[PDB]
């Protein structure tokens, strides 16, 4: 069965999205924003106390298949929201004043593959013309300086940028949803591992966002809040200079759509376990990450 304290396969997560919604219809509704190359449903959970014309914050997990702690966190977040609503004053204010769009697993096909065949798989599972090599890197497939740096044109590489921007059903789906809901979405948060970083634009170029100072201060303060629990140390900054230049990422793309607060979170750890983070760390990782997310949420709220 489903556990927030263990890593769950896709069958279990899909059942969970229906179940948690069913148990908390007052705080959650579910849709799909599209289907994957292999026909799986890309579920989106709308978390919040329903109401007219509320602002929103968008968060996805599971862009990259092997980064299992990411998927884990989106599930954790949803439970924490429904548990503490009405009991913890900040979360209660958050869900009353805005909605969270939580996309638990974007790259479902790849995630299934990490369970069935190859634990270190990263990309999607789409086919490519002229080769048997499989998959596009979803975080190289957005229309943001697309395929110009830090990406590969070789389908056999783990950073393959795709045949065109939004060539992938999963990425086109995510981009379509954000475009369609741009007037309400105030922040974009995409959850990865590993490295323990908070990153903001730009990665597709060395240039800086006009609110570079604001983003840096917000990231800095969120890192502090995260460290308060267990002393876990995060680093922060523009993606290009903080980890590497990389084009076609969704954080940059979202920011260039006019979403002024856009962050890539890279969770635990720093390499001891890497992608294969032990389940015994799921709880602590998620608890500390919650503090950073809630700090950003509070900030967005007072900067509407």
């Amino acid at each position: 069965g489903h556990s927030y304290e263990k890593y769950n396969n896709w069958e279990t997560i899909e059942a969970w999205t229906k179940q948690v919604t069913s148990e908390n219809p007052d705080l959650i509704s579910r849709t799909a924003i599209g289907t994957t190359f292999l026909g799986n449903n890309i579920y989106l959970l709308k978390v919040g106390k329903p109401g007219p014309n509320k602002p929103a914050i968008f968060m996805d997990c599971g862009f990259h298949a092997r980064e299992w702690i990411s998927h884990a966190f989106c599930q954790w977040f949803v439970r924490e929201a429904v548990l503490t609503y009405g009991y913890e004053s900040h979360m209660t204010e958050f869900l009353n004043k805005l909605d969270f769009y939580v996309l638990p697993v974007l790259n479902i096909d790849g995630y299934i593959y990490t369970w069935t065949k190859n634990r270190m798989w990263r990309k999607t599972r789409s086919t490519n013309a002229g080769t048997t090599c499989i998959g596009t890197d979803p975080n190289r497939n957005f229309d943001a300086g697309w395929c110009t740096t830090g990406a590969s044109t070789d389908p056999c590489d783990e950073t393959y940028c795709g045949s065109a921007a939004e060539s992938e059903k999963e990425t086109k789906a995510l981009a379509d949803f954000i475009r369609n809901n741009l007037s309400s979405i105030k922040a974009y948060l995409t959850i990865h591992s590993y490295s323990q970083m908070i990153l903001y634009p730009y990665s597709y170029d060395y240039k800086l966002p006009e609110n570079n100072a604001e983003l840096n201060n917000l990231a800095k303060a969120a890192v502090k809040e995260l460290a308060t629990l267990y002393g876990t140390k995060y680093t922060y900054g523009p993606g290009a200079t903080t980890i590497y230049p990389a084009a076609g990422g969704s954080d940059d793309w979202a920011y260039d759509q006019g979403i002024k607060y856009s962050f890539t979170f890279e969770l635990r750890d720093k390499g001891r376990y890497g992608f294969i983070l032990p389940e015994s760390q799921i709880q602590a990782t998620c608890e500390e990450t919650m503090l950073a997310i809630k700090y950003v949420t509070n900030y967005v709220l007072g900067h509407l």
Partner: peptide, 5 residues
């Protein structure tokens, strides 16, 4: 998350 950075 690119190997091996």
């Amino acid at each position: 998350x690119v190997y091996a950075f």
